Write an enzyme that holds these catalytic residues in place. Sequence first.
Site, short mmCIF file in Angstrom:
data_model
loop_
_atom_site.label_atom_id
_atom_site.label_comp_id
_atom_site.label_asym_id
_atom_site.label_seq_id
_atom_site.Cartn_x
_atom_site.Cartn_y
_atom_site.Cartn_z
N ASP A 51 -51.59 121.94 20.46
CA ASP A 51 -50.43 122.75 20.07
C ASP A 51 -49.25 122.46 21.00
O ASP A 51 -48.21 121.97 20.57
CB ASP A 51 -50.81 124.24 20.12
CG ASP A 51 -49.76 125.15 19.49
OD1 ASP A 51 -48.75 124.65 18.94
OD2 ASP A 51 -49.94 126.38 19.56
N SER A 52 -49.42 122.75 22.28
CA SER A 52 -48.50 122.24 23.28
C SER A 52 -48.84 120.79 23.61
O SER A 52 -49.92 120.29 23.27
CB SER A 52 -48.53 123.11 24.53
OG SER A 52 -49.79 123.05 25.16
N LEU A 53 -47.88 120.12 24.24
CA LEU A 53 -47.96 118.73 24.70
C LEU A 53 -48.19 117.72 23.58
O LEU A 53 -48.65 116.60 23.84
CB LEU A 53 -49.03 118.54 25.80
N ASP A 54 -47.90 118.09 22.33
CA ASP A 54 -47.78 117.14 21.23
C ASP A 54 -46.64 117.53 20.31
O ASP A 54 -46.49 116.93 19.23
CB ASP A 54 -49.09 117.03 20.45
N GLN A 55 -45.88 118.54 20.68
CA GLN A 55 -44.60 118.92 20.11
C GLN A 55 -43.55 119.03 21.19
O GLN A 55 -42.35 119.01 20.91
CB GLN A 55 -44.76 120.25 19.35
CG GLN A 55 -43.60 120.68 18.45
CD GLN A 55 -43.91 121.95 17.70
OE1 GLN A 55 -44.96 122.56 17.88
NE2 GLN A 55 -42.99 122.37 16.83
#
Lengths: 107, 56, 458, 141, 55, 83, 114, 51, 57, 173
Positions: F38-42
């Site tokens: 969820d974080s660290l790929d957006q």
Amino acid sequence: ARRYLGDASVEPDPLRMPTFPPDYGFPERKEREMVATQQEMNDAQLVLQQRDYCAHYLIRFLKCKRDSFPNFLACKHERHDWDYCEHLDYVKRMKEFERERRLLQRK
Amino acid sequence: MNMFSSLSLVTLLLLTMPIMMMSFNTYKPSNYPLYVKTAISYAFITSMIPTMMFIH
Amino acid sequence: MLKYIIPTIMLMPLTWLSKNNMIWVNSTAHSLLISFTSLLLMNQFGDNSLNFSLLFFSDSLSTPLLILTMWLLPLMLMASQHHLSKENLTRKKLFITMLISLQLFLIMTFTAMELILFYILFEATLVPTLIIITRWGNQTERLNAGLYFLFYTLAGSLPLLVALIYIQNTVGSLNFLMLQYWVQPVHNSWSNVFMWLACMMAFMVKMPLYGLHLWLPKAHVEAPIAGSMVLAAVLLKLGGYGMLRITLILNPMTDFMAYPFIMLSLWGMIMTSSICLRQTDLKSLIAYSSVSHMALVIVAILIQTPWSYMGATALMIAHGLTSSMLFCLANSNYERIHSRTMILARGLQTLLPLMATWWLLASLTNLALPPTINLIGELFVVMSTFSWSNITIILMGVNMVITALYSLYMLIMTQRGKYTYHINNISPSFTRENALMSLHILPLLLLTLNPKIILGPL
Amino acid sequence: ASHITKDMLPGPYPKTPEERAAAAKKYNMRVEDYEPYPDDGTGYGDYPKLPDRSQQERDPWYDWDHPDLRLNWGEPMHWDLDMYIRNRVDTSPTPVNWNLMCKHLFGFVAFMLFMFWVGETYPAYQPVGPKQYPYNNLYLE
Amino acid sequence: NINENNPLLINSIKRLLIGSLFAGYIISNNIPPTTIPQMTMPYYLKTTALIVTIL
Amino acid sequence: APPLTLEGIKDRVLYVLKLYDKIDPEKLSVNSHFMKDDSLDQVEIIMAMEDEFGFEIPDIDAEKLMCPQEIVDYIADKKDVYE
Amino acid sequence: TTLDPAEYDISSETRKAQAERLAIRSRLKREYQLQYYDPSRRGVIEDPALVRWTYARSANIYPNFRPNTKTSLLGALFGIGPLVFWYYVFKTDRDRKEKLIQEGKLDRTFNISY
Amino acid sequence: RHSIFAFTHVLIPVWIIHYYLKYHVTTKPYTIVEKKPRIFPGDTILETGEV
Amino acid sequence: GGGAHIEPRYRQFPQLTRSQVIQAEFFSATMWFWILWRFWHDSDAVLGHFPYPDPSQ
Amino acid sequence: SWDKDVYPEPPRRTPAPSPQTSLPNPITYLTKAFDLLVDRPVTLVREFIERQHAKNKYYYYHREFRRVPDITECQEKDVLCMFEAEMQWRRDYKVDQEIVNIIQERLKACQQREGESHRQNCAKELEQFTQVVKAYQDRYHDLGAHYSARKCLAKQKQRMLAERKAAKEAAAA
């Protein structure tokens, strides 16, 4: 040395001086060393804090500055000689505190 | 001796000439940063002259 | 005035006698021709004094003061044509005649030769100015402000008739200021205190104090069409010069009670400047500025001893041109934005770049740029009251510091971005907007070339 | 010509729920933490119902604030709380109240006592007694 | 997108540094004197402010 | 003084696909939609343009940036690109 | 100092139905932009938030006012307070200077100006 | 040329302002107020000398 | 836009024009020509000094 | 022009430059070229007006007044005799202003002449200027009756205090 008595004229800005103002003066050696001239001290435009010792050599050191007009240095040995007149005068005055630590204490 | 300070008054006058030419009174084809730089360029040697008379 | 009132009364049977819309170009044309006749016979020499002809004129010898009285009538007709042209022609011409009639009493006034002709001319105004507030003004709460425009000046001025006739029946006759050579002194009593009190208090009604001045931001706030008689109300406030006529003599030696007029006009001086940094109105913004450095001159007079009459001669005309010019700025930017509230004027300086120079030099007369006619007199107020005591520089100097912010508080309000609105306010400052905006600094810095004529006796 | 609720009135308890928002929508349905209860304390000449003060304050500060213009420049519709003090004022930074500058100005308050001392160059201190001997005591010889 | 080629700027920098280095060395080289110099700067008291710059 | 056109960003958005070592240079060029990679790929996928472009990346730029060409779309509206 | 300013608090799940307070303003914002976008307006927006601002500030404070409290009579400690104090300074002034000007002299003899 | 672009600029206002000073000293009683000689010897401008 | 005198880069070290570096080189030398007058001829204190001025006797 | 006794100064006393060196100096190149580029556009045009201004002459005359009464005439409540005495006294005051301006720049003649000494010389202007302005504010400066100009009704009555309280109430001078 200087400061005997009786400044007769009413001239303030103490250029009407006894002989010449020293730094403090004299005190010991010599107790009287006089100064230079005073008829030309006011005639030639020479400002205050310049009526001290080594003055007539400075009045001649300032002669060749105008007397060599497109020049960068009139006589560089003379500036080392006016300073040697100045520095030997100052070391002569530096013998106060060695006298003051010595003569003022109990004996 | 009169030209000791007379060149100073000339120096204190030509600054108004880019201002006098701002009134669109047959003004120069504009080049105004260039024209101002030329106006300063001749005052410096005019300013240089009475410095020599003072130190004498 | 041999024939100065005589040509200008003939201008009155020319308004309704004339044709249609020619009445504006005709009325301005004749009006400037009198301005040379003012300049010509006056400005003569000059050593105590020029008693002019007779019992109706003393030629304004010690203080000229009369040139400024005659600029304004060929100056406001070009201003009042902004929003007036919606009515019948016979009704519009009446509005022209009443302003011309305002000048004629004030032409005989400021010279006046006497004192019993003074008071009837000192009260000869307030009849045309009041009618201007009633008809063709702005939105409501006019009528109470018309009543506050009365009931103060008339309230204080009535003991002058109690004072002056008490002098006329006692010692000689007050027809002649120059037959005032014999003047008995006035000692401290419980009767003579009131004799000085009624002699002075009526003059504090017009040039204001920290007291009794609530009416002044009513006529300037609720005001006629676009600063029309508001420019005349500038001369109406400064035209209380008559203290220079009276208290120069006629109990001069009562200075023991001078102090509560010194003090009240001094802490009230520093206060009313800061009483408008949170004001939300443009026409009120210049109004409270016009209190402060107009209250500066009062301590220059009750303190006697010239080097104080020098600057006080010039400080009457100081804001007299300046605040008249600021109202010309405020009369503009209202035909385009129909509300006078200053906050709505974000996003200026880009649509009108030509008048943006005129904002700069106008507010540069409050900082006042010491080679002008403003800081040439304020230095002499410094030169007087510092000889009084050493404390007086403090409260008077901060007045030079508060209006430094208070003037640039207006200038920065012009510079904002994207303006959010304004499919109206298109008009890029037409000829009437900028030619009328001229002729204010154009004589002002002109008078700063040789400021010799702006000097009292003194 | 807007006469209906043209300004505030003698509030703040003349059915204060019917104040906001029959007009002057400072609150949505009189529970928005901005119902016109906040007449500071009345009795004075403060604000009455007054779509005015103690609403959330201390800055309009020209933020990022993109959902409208809405910060200070670009006219959001009706959210007036207080004005004429905020075109030049801001929110809280990372440090907190600590008045260390008076302690920082206290660095010379120790050396303000040093202003009473003298500054002769030669000789050294030797601060033990009157053996320093500053001025002239005796004569020449 | 660096760029350093404009002789307008080259005229300015070259005019300064010629006058900059010879600033204190031509003006003070020729001056009428006004006051008295120090001429005494003793042991441990003379040039150590230069050493203050070194550290 | 140097201008800019559409072709510069069409290099860089495609280049950082291969610069990030987690994403191989075998994906789709302009529309990979990032859920197939969820974080660290957006945030991390645009934390590199925080280094290179870095105009502070506002809060609405996250929910638009799924479609990788819809990343590229509004930059020309922000950076005022040619014609 | 001014302020902390408490830029963070708790949630999850305090006042679940408190949301859509933007529905008050977005309806006005829809009423704003529909008024803002039109082919012919040529004038300013009425904007009654500024209408209700100055007129309920410049006026309608004296109808609000009553002297039913002494914190409304508290202006006696600010208006007339220092106004006595400057005269309390100045009445002590100008007479001590005068006594040294009457009895004895201190001025220079070339004080023509003044 | 460098013929009239500077000649209108600098070479014309030279004569006007020098006329404003030569017609000034004979009118105003305080002209240029140049200071003293500051001379240490005695020279040929005088008749005496100094050591 | 109009001129391509200095090329755009992508961190490849775009080269110089190789004529500014001559004037860069020249005024790195005449400033260290001025290391002449630093010592030659100029000393730290051309004054002389005091022998801890004791001998009052 | 003027009269030199009104504005005295000592003679100029300009020394010799004393070059003494064979080095090329720029002062021998400046005064030898710039003198002729000024004398041609100025002095000849100054001569061209000099013949043209002498084409016609115009006269303007001195104004000398008439002073029959001085002080004590006349009786109290009068008008006629107490108007010429005002024209006496007031024109006897504007003369006394600019007399001081002569003596003020007389001090300024000494100060920008010596410069170096400037205090212990010139022997008069620290004394004589303070023998005028000191003898000025007494009885000729209506302190602080200068606002109403004190026209013959207070300038004599300071001098009433200068004779009644002064010089007799010294107990007993």
